[PDB]
Structures are given as structure tokens and as C-alpha cells.
Ligand binder design. Structure first.
Ligand SMILES: [Au+]
Ligand SMILES: [Au+]
Ligand SMILES: [Au+]
Ligand SMILES: [Au+]
Ligand SMILES: [Au+]
Ligand SMILES: [Au+]
Ligand SMILES: [Au+]
Ligand SMILES: [Au+]
Ligand SMILES: [Au+]
Ligand SMILES: [Au+]
Ligand SMILES: [Au+]
Ligand SMILES: [Au+]
Ligand SMILES: [Au+]
Ligand SMILES: [Au+]
Ligand SMILES: [Au+]
Ligand SMILES: [Au+]
Ligand SMILES: [Au+]
Ligand SMILES: [Au+]
Ligand SMILES: [Au+]
Ligand SMILES: [Ca+2]
Ligand SMILES: [Ca+2]
Ligand SMILES: [Ca+2]
Ligand SMILES: [Ca+2]
Ligand SMILES: [Ca+2]
Ligand SMILES: [Ca+2]
Ligand SMILES: [Ca+2]
Ligand SMILES: [Ca+2]
Lengths: 172, 172, 172, 172, 172, 172
């Protein structure tokens, strides 16, 4: 037992480990999407660039969760990082739609983690999530929601013109 | 025989001369395309400007090959520079498609030159190509590939709107 | 078949995919080591910081290989990213020793990739490796070799004083 | 017929095309001379550099004539660009003498073009030549004339000392 | 066996040692030439200065080869450094001619080293030579070639005026 | 006989030649030591760096002696430069001890040269040594003496910790 451990529940420790892997997967997903848009047959450079940043974000979000485990005397147990669902993501709209769902899945998971923190009576972990995850997940979700909304009304994905202009004007 | 000659094969010398002319032709082709887009009935100023730079590039690439012949004690033999295939290049998409093919033809030629350099056991010429040609030909090819990909999905060439917006947003 | 493909062998494409995953694994390994040294019972902040940079490096090295696949008309196929061997890395010396071996394994793999590139007669891929991987792998290996050499002669790992001072004076 | 055409005679259009090719040839000639002086057995770096600029000049002079065709609704028809007369230009004096003659030949041609412009009653083309060609051709000719005059009186071409010092003091 | 050794052939190690000594000898040769031109009966200060830099260059080129041995786990074995052929180098032309030959001898040796690297299948050593030696040896050789060409045509070495002016205008 | 010779004794000339070679040998020795500390199994970067400067110093000290020969109308006769005694220098302490001895040997030689200068009644050569050699040799010797003194009292060479810390704190 860590000399620094205090009010940290075995279950929390395991959940944090669980989340650390979830965040890393969401990083792999975005990285994958990114390089999809880098293909000579796809060629949206700002979509590519956008998702590459989303990738850095989720990865950074995970390392912060690794620091948190260490801070509270827990122990990091890493798991295999599961390849994403698809290799070809079809279109800009179809990836933004996949991203939204992903973000809502990671968000769901974070909310679970919050209830657990509360049930175990753990304020430090509860505010840590509130402050550093839940708030920035609502943002991400509205961002993607908006993009999906613009791309649709623009005639996507049946209109490579829509995706092209979007790429330029909104993701530029 | 040049006082500076060393490990330079007669065949290489001839191939370099062969390539020096190929690179100059690709310069004439681009120059031609450029001024095609400068016509009052075509009027894409950034397509024009783009191809004019491609022209300067291929020309510079050739003079570098002339310096290489001199460096290694070879002897430059210039040949007539053959007018290009067409005078009217139809559209932005249709020129970008012609450019891609040209780039792949010059690339083919450079690869030939590399095998020959290797067969004659000539490391200085082999890395010279690797470093100063082959690498920058892969780039050019993906660039053009991307442009062809964007123009198509944009509704080109049946849509002068596609070409116009492309000219502005991507070639600007 | 990609409009940009030229001289790219099916086998190479598959090997690049193979290497892209190897480089990502070496990133996960380092990330893991890093946060090992961030534990309250380990507490070497510069060892932690060092390995975190090694992690960013290998990851960057992989994304560059993903750009290469796209550049040459290949197709990126991602695989699961395998959790590392250990969770507890014992000591500074013992991780530096594990790192050296890892680096030599990735190096081995890169050399394999070079022979294959050559056999398929692929100069662009051959110099790409020479220039962007093999050279920087020799460096990394001597770096780690040196660290292992200093830590040993310092009385590590039986002497937490050695590791501590090293952390400060050499990794600071 | 171009929407912009006005007072432009079929004959003029053809002559401009004729001149566009003449100017490009004079560019190839100079480029050739340049790299002659870059040979290890010749080695006059400023003669080389001088003629390379003359090359850029004539090329620029031609592209300006291509813009002129487009401006007035004409149509550019490119022809093969004829390799120069010689491969070995003998000496500094002997190239400067060949250059003078070339310049006088291109000048002759421009004067022809001026009479034709006048006969067809075409003031815009007449001043275009006066302003952008004829004036700068008189200059070039006196420049070369002077060089030939200095090199001779210096003991050239029988005196590699003359050519060497000239290269340094006048072309430096 | 070095903890860092990988794909490094015994023969290569020995050749590198062989080259390390060759490069150092070429340094001694130049140093010798330099101070020849510093003699009150010779008195060409820029020839002296020129060869002193050539000396620093070859020496630096050797220490880089010593770093390479260490990098790859080889072992440096130094040999006696053989005094040069002559003490009196006669003239500027006659030293530049001796230098050219030396450069071509060292170049020959480097090429040998490249074939060996290739035969042993050693890409890291092969590009190391390509990048850091072969390329910069072609340059040096054309430089010297040019100097020999200028000095001859200037009336050297029968004309101390030629050597004097050269010293000033070209080596200054 | 040199037009500049005055009061310069045949014996002095020969001794200067003798010293020019001694100084160059001491340069080779240090260079050798330097790269000993660059080995992956040794790995003291500041010891390496230190001795590399000592190498530049002794070399510079020799070229100054070559200028002196020329200044006084003597004639430089170079001899083979003898490889050093050892290839493996064991430790930091053991090299610093070898360096001290070397410095005292070169110092001995310089003192011999001073007596000879005096006996031949040669004030210019006597002060040249006093000013540019003897004074800076006393310094070097106390420097090395001190290093040997610190390394010993630090527990060297039985304590790689001593050498490591020394390398950092004193040679850094
Ligand atoms: Au980012
Ligand atoms: Au909750
Ligand atoms: Au956040
Ligand atoms: Au340009
Ligand atoms: Au090849
Ligand atoms: Au290039
Ligand atoms: Au980093
Ligand atoms: Au290979
Ligand atoms: Au790298
Ligand atoms: Au110019
Ligand atoms: Au006229
Ligand atoms: Au002009
Ligand atoms: Au220098
Ligand atoms: Au070779
Ligand atoms: Au170099
Ligand atoms: Au002069
Ligand atoms: Au130094
Ligand atoms: Au004395
Ligand atoms: Au001194
Ligand atoms: Ca799976
Ligand atoms: Ca034709
Ligand atoms: Ca597993
Ligand atoms: Ca290479
Ligand atoms: Ca012809
Ligand atoms: Ca000898
Ligand atoms: Ca010996
Ligand atoms: Ca005194």
C-alpha cells in the first residue's frame, strides 16, 4: 500500500485504469481517421489536420489520468490498445458522425466514473473529473454536432464540393 | 579524358545527357500549360502561376544535372527541345491529369537511371539521384494526385465553378 | 490501384504496415516506463521525462511512416497495439537495459525492411529508411549504451544514490 | 475569334509566335555557353555566371511575348526548340563573338517585326517592341561589343591570362 | 563484443580503421604543403592559407570516422602517420596537381569502402559514406581540377606572375 | 642559405624540426585518449572533450613552431608521426597520469631546446621558448597534477562514481 494513498478505493483505481485505456483508444481512432484524409483519393488536408489534433488531445487526456493514478498511490496497469473499427472512413461527414458517437461513448464512461467516485465518497476524484474531463467533453460534443449539421445542410456527403469548401472555410 | 573523371561510366554520362533533355522538355510542357490558363477564354490566374513555378522547378532540376556532368568530368551534349503534345489543354483537371502522367514518366526515367548507376557501381550518382530527384518526385506526384482528386469530387471539369473555386482556395 | 503508385511492391506496402505498428509499440513501451518513474516509490523525475520524450519520438517516427504509405499509394492497415511486457520496470538501469534491447529490435526490423526495399529495387524507400531511420537508430543505441555504462560503473542498481545522481546530472 | 481581339493582324500573331521561339532559342544558346565555362578544362566561373543571366533574360523576354499574344487575343503555338550550333565554344572571346552575332540576329528579327507592325498599322505592338525590346537590344549589343574589344586588346584568346583577368575584373 | 554492435562486420571495422589513417595522412600532406608556401623563398600567403584549411578538413573528416567506429561498437586502432613524399613542393601548380591526385586516391579508397559496406549488407555505413564523404570528394576534386586548369592557362609554373595573381584573385 | 637567415644555428634548426614532431605526437596521443572516452563502454563525455582540446592545443603549438622555422630561414623536415603507446587507456585517472608524464617529457625537451638556444647565443629563440612554451607548460603540468590529485582522493579509479562526478563537476 502506497505511502500516499488516502480515501482511494480499489474500484476507483481499476476504473481509472479502465479509462486510461479508453482515452488511448479514442486517440488511435482519431489518428486513423486523420491519415484516412491524407490519402491521394481523399485529400482533405484540414480534416486530416483536425483529427490529428483530436488525437493529441485524447492522448494528452490519458497521460493526465496516468499522473492521477500515481498522485493518489494507485498503480497503472496498461492493456492492449484495440485497433479501430474501420480502415476506410468513407467521407468527412461520415467520420464526423463516427467521432460524435465516440465522444458520446467516452463521455458516458466518464459519467460512470463520476457516479462511482461519488458513491465511494471521493471528492478529489469527483472534482478532478468535473474540472478536467466532463466540462471539456460537452464542448467537444457540440463542436462535432455543429460540424455534422453544417456538412449535412451543405449537401454532404453526396457533394464533394460541400466537403471541400467545408474543409477550407471551417477547418482551415 | 577529364582530369577529374573517376568511376564515371560512359553509359552514365550518356544517360545524364538523356535526362538533362527530359527535364528540359518537362519544363517546356509546364510553361505551355501555364500560358494556356492565361488566355482570355480560360482565365485561371493561379493555375497559370502554379504551372509557371513547376516550369522553373524542372528547368532548375536540369541545370543541376548539367552541373553534375561537369563535376564528374562528363561532357554535356544538348539536343533539340521537343514542343509539347498539345497547344490547348482543355481544362484545369485535364492539365493536372496530364501533369501527373508527365511526372510519372520523368520518375520512371529517373528510376532507370538509378538502376544503371547501381549496376555500374556508382554510389555518388546513386545518392545524388536518391537525394535530389527521386525523393522530390514522390512529393510532386502525390501533390498532383491530390489536385486531381479534389477537382473530380468538385464536379470538374463539367463545372467551371469547381475549377474557379479550386483556383482560388487551393492554388491561391 | 492508386493513381500515384509507381515501383511500389505489395510486399513493401505490407512491411511498412508492419513497421508502423512496431514503432507504435515502442512508443507504448516508453510511455509505460516513463510513468513507472513517476511513482511515489520510484520518483526519478528526469528518467520519467526522458522516456516520455522517447515515447513522442517513436510515435512521431510512426506517423511519418503513415505519411510514407499515403505518399506512395499504399494503404494503411492498423493493428491492435500490444501492451508492454512488464508493468514494474525495477530500476533506472534495468529500464535503460530494456530500452537498448528494444531499440536493437526495432533496428533489426528496419534493416530487414531495407534489404526488402533493395531486393524489390526501390531506391525511394531505401533512401527514406537510410535517411530517416537507420541513421537515427545508431544514435539512439549508442546513447542508451552509454547510459547503461555510466549507471553500472556508478554502483547501480544496488545504489539508489547512483540512480539519483545520474537522474540529476545526466538526465537533467 | 477572341472577345478581346482588336486591330490584331493574322500576320502579326504568326510573327509573335515566330519571335517567341527565336527568343527561347537564344536562351538555350546562352545556357549552353554558360555550362561550357563550368567545365573543369575551362573554369571561368564569371563567364559561366554571366551567360546564365543572359539565358534568364532571353527566356524572360520570351514569356513576356507570350503574355502579349494572350493580351491581344492571339494564340500561342510553340515549336521545337533547336539545339545550338556547337557544344564546345572554344574560348571566352569566341563565345562573346558568337553572342554578339546572335544578339544582332535576334535584333534583325525584332526590327522585321516592327516594320510589319507598322505596315499593318498597329501602334500598340509597335511601341511594345520599341519600349521592351529594341531599346534593350542596342544596349546588349554595345555591352558585348565592348567585351570583345577588351578581350582582343588583352591578348585573347591566345592568352589564358587575358581571359582569366577579364573574368575576374570585368565579369566579377 | 560491444553492447551496441549490430550488423557491423569485422571487415568493415578494419576498413574504417584503415580509412581513419588515410584521412589523417592526407591532413599531414596538406599541412606540409601549406608551410611550404610560407617559406621566404616561396611566399604565397593564400596558397599557404588554402592548404591549411584543406588540412583541417581532412583531419575533421577523420575524427568523424573515429566517432563512427565508436557509434557502431567497433574499436579504434591507430597506426603511425606516414610523413609525406616530398619536403619541397616546387610550385603552386605542382602542389595543386599533387593535391588532385591525393584527393583521387582517398576517393578511390572511399569507393572501395562503399562496395565492402554493400557486400556486407550494411546500409547505415553505406549512406554514411554516400552522405558524408563521397559527395564532398567529388566537389573537392572539381575544385582542384579547376585550379590546375587556371594555373596552366595562366602560364604557370614558368610564370611567377601567374601564381602571384592567382594567389591574390582566386585564393584570396 | 635563406636571405632572412641571421644568427640561426644549424643545430637549432634541427632541434626545432625535432620539437615540431614531438609536439605533433603529443597531439596524436591526446586525440587517441579523447576517443577512448567516447567508447560506449567508457562514456565520459567531458574527459573526451577535454583531451580533444589538449589535442588541438599541442597541434597549434607545433604549427607555431613551423612558422618559427620559416621566420628564421630554416627548413622544415617532417618525420613520420608515431602511433601512441596504448589503444586502451584504462581509466580517467590512468590517462590523466599518462598525460602528466607526457607533458613532463615534452617539457624536458623544451628545456633542452632552451639550453641549446642559449649556448648558441640565440636570444630570439630563447625568448620565443620562454614566452610561448615553457610558461604554458608549467601551467598544463599543475592542471594535470591537480586532476590526478582530485581523482585519487575521490576513490578513483576503483570507483566509477568518482570518475563520473569528476567528469561532471570539474571537466564540465
Ligand atoms: Au495538437
Ligand atoms: Au455523478
Ligand atoms: Au480538458
Ligand atoms: Au518559381
Ligand atoms: Au535502383
Ligand atoms: Au528536388
Ligand atoms: Au518530446
Ligand atoms: Au540493405
Ligand atoms: Au530520425
Ligand atoms: Au539572372
Ligand atoms: Au519599323
Ligand atoms: Au528589355
Ligand atoms: Au579551416
Ligand atoms: Au558501392
Ligand atoms: Au564532407
Ligand atoms: Au589584378
Ligand atoms: Au580546442
Ligand atoms: Au636554458
Ligand atoms: Au602557450
Ligand atoms: Ca482486435
Ligand atoms: Ca516535333
Ligand atoms: Ca496481449
Ligand atoms: Ca543513400
Ligand atoms: Ca537539330
Ligand atoms: Ca616513412
Ligand atoms: Ca610504430
Ligand atoms: Ca625573456
Amino acid at each position: 500500500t502506497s505511502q500516499v494513498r488516502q480515501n482511494y478505493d480499489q474500484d476507483s483505481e481499476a476504473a481509472i485504469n479502465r479509462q486510461i485505456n479508453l482515452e488511448l483508444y479514442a486517440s488511435y481512432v482519431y489518428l486513423s481517421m486523420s491519415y484516412y484524409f491524407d490519402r491521394d483519393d481523399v485529400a482533405l488536408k484540414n480534416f486530416a489536420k483536425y483529427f490529428l489534433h483530436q488525437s493529441h488531445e485524447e492522448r494528452c487526456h490519458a497521460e493526465k489520468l496516468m499522473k492521477l493514478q500515481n498522485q493518489r498511490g494507485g498503480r497503472i496497469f496498461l492493456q492492449d490498445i484495440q485497433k479501430p473499427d474501420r480502415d476506410d472512413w468513407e467521407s468527412g461527414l461520415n467520420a464526423m458522425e463516427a467521432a460524435l458517437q465516440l465522444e458520446k461513448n467516452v463521455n458516458q464512461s466518464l459519467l460512470e466514473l463520476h457516479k462511482l467516485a461519488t458513491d465511494k465518497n471521493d471528492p478529489h476524484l469527483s472534482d478532478f473529473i468535473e474540472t478536467h474531463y466532463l466540462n471539456c467533453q460537452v464542448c467537444a460534443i457540440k463542436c462535432l454536432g455543429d460540424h455534422v449539421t453544417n456538412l449535412r445542410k451543405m449537401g454532404a456527403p453526396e457533394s464533394g464540393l460541400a466537403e471541400y469548401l467545408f474543409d477550407k472555410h471551417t477547418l482551415g
